Amino acid sequence: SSESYETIFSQRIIRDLQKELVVGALFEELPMSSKILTMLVEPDAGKATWVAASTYGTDTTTGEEVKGALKEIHFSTYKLAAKSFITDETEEDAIFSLLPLLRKRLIEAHAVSIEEAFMTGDGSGKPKGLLTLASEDSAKVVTEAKADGSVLVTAKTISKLRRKLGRHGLKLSKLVLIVSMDAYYDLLEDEEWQDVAQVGNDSVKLQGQVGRIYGLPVVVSEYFPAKANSAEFAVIVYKDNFVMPRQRAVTVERERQAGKQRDAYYVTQRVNLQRYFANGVVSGTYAAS
Amino acid sequence: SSESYETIFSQRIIRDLQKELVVGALFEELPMSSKILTMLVEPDAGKATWVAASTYGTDTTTGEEVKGALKEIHFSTYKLAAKSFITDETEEDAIFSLLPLLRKRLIEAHAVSIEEAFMTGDGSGKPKGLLTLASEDSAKVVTEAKADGSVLVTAKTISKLRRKLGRHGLKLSKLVLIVSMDAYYDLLEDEEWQDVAQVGNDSVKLQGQVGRIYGLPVVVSEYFPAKANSAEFAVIVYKDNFVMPRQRAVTVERERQAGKQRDAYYVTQRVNLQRYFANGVVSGTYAAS
Amino acid sequence: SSESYETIFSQRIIRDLQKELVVGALFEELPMSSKILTMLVEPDAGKATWVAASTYGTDTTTGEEVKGALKEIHFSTYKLAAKSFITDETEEDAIFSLLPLLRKRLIEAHAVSIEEAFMTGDGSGKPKGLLTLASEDSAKVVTEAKADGSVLVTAKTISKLRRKLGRHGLKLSKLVLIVSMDAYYDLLEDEEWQDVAQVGNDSVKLQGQVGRIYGLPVVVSEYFPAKANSAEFAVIVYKDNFVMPRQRAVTVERERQAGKQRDAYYVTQRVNLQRYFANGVVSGTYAAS
């Protein structure tokens, strides 16, 4: 009889130890006790992060500010399927120690699917994810390239992305980068590198994921597709929108029978991805034309 | 907690108030102690049970005489249950008021489909279905109507069939009518009122149903399949032709899993539809053929 | 000093005691306590609860099958404040019995505003309103009465949409109907008039609302805009459609200063009133067209 309930506190430390891949997330881990956390905030744009507090009470030009942004924010999480069973009660000659090393990559396999789902998700046994998200939300400019045929995907597409992003967020905050992988293969052997490109560590000195142009910490990693027609870029403020709230934990029950002489490890992520304002991200595009 | 014996009571009284659907079933609901109930008698489908027994004792025709009515008088009910499940995860918020205000709908839609079965069902899983039992008595004898092209029968057929179980149905205590709502629109709001259709309230007296011919309360709709080829009428003496054996007083069990944090309840029901003799409803056709 | 905390239970209790407008100001009320009562449930839409479950059973069309379901069954609230002080500053040369003289009027302003927001309304801050509901429901199929003048003040409208919702729900429990004053005289003390609204109790018998059209009591309440175009009906069953997640037990906010020739008693309310299902209300129709 293996598998009582003792991997659990270890699995919590595994939850800590796997936000260690930050391939598409670093945000506000909202501690969740209820189910939804709404707030209907004074928005990013519109603020007016400063008002004068010594001169007139917002009159001429003007004090509101401008547009946008708007989305009624609310944070109710999602479940992720990962629940498993393995060569379960075969270990009935008293092993006990083989369990977490018999774990500790399947939890990673969960996390792989999780971060992919945050990159790519509608809401189905995983939360709301980016390429089914901003795809209809002021991201996909077409066409700032030429379908991987000597493309301008160098530093001027992300210039028309950073300048465009200047209202959705601000300037260089976070306004970062997440590419495909053939996107960064265009951005490998790129001329621009006007401040930095390859291998271009370069400072590193704040973030710096895998690649940097204008200090835009590129995520290569092919989590967003390419095949000419997909996403390729992400000048996005990652320090305002799009956080992952946290309920309690993915836990597990180590269920007994379960026939076929089997057990069950209910690996079961329990969080969400949702933004905050209208835009933060431009993805793509990097179409097939 | 809840999802418990504590809350089956506001989940079971819904039977008491909505066994009461006056849409398709009214009988002497037999209260059952055993299960496979059966009598062995031969009912009076030939009797005649004294001349006096006199100077003669009816010796010639016939020797039994006819059937019979040794079926023999079996009964064997039918399990009936939706699976019930609530958000068996989210509320630890003690809402409770919830599952009152959430359902009373399960017994209900349970009963809805149950009466779809009652009007219409081939005997297994369900007990007896009416139009399927009507589909053996030649209840839908051909023809009366004219295939959805200005159909003209008033209660003309009702007089004919009224004779046809003027046979061992007397008249109008009880003997009742279900029609279709297509039949409610091709006949109610006719001018007729042929003795009555319109307005058919017609006081409104005791319990009754919507509209009335000759005294007979009237139901319509749905569970009558239209398509011109039907019984768009349903006439029978309920009292003689058919009865309710009903066994299982309501049990639902609110054991938990059922995984994925959504657990298990089951709206168990064993009642049965059963009759006696031979042809007891004649109704339709009313053809498309 | 008064007007801070001395008569409040007063105001909530008399607000209970004329929460009393038999038009919508009672409904399917959930005395709520969550901020958003959310659930993800799948009520009476799709199932087919039990079915025979023994032989074949759900194997071809359609799987889900159609709706469904989901909404999700969130229940927020709407903040129904008032904000009428009077200046207690020098209006205080011994009054005090004005506290048994002042009030009363204010919740009257509350409830009138409450109903007119309730029947026509946008969801932004109110609930979405019932007359506007039928507009976004398009439940409002025209014509059935000719547009202020020679209006066919009938009830076959009523009967048609009655079985249409009896295609949806069932019949004659409750089924209700809110009329105009134009429909009040237009279907009170006309001739026939109609089905039944002569008398206009119409028995009275039931728990309470003036009129009864085969079970449809007659609500003027006078918020329909005339001008030939609106409904002059509200064909719905109450006891199917729409609940009231009614939230908060009201506290006034008799705040003192607010100085310089004034004071501040803001008042409050919080309820919500929420659609239960799909399209369960019809209206008019009767319009200008």
UniProtKB/Swiss-Prot annotation, chains A, B, C:
Documented effect of changing E91G: Confers resistance to Pycsar-mediated defense
Entry's localization field: Virion
Superkingdom as given in the UniProt entry: Viruses
Effect listed in the UniProt record for changing I14T: Confers resistance to Pycsar-mediated defense
Subunit relationships: Interacts with the decoration protein; each hexon binds a single copy of the decoration protein. Interacts with the portal protein.
Function statement: Major capsid protein that self-associates to form 120 hexamers and 11 pentamers, building the T=13 icosahedral capsid which about 860 Angstroms in diameter. Responsible for its self-assembly into a procapsid. The phage does not need to encode a separate scaffolfing protein because its capsid protein contains the delta domain that carries that function. The capsid gains its final stability through the reorganization of the subunits that takes place upon expansion. DNA encapsidation through the portal triggers capsid expansion and the binding of the decoration protein to the capsid exterior.
The protein's name: Major capsid protein
Gene label: D20
Portion of the parent chain present: 170 to 458 of 458
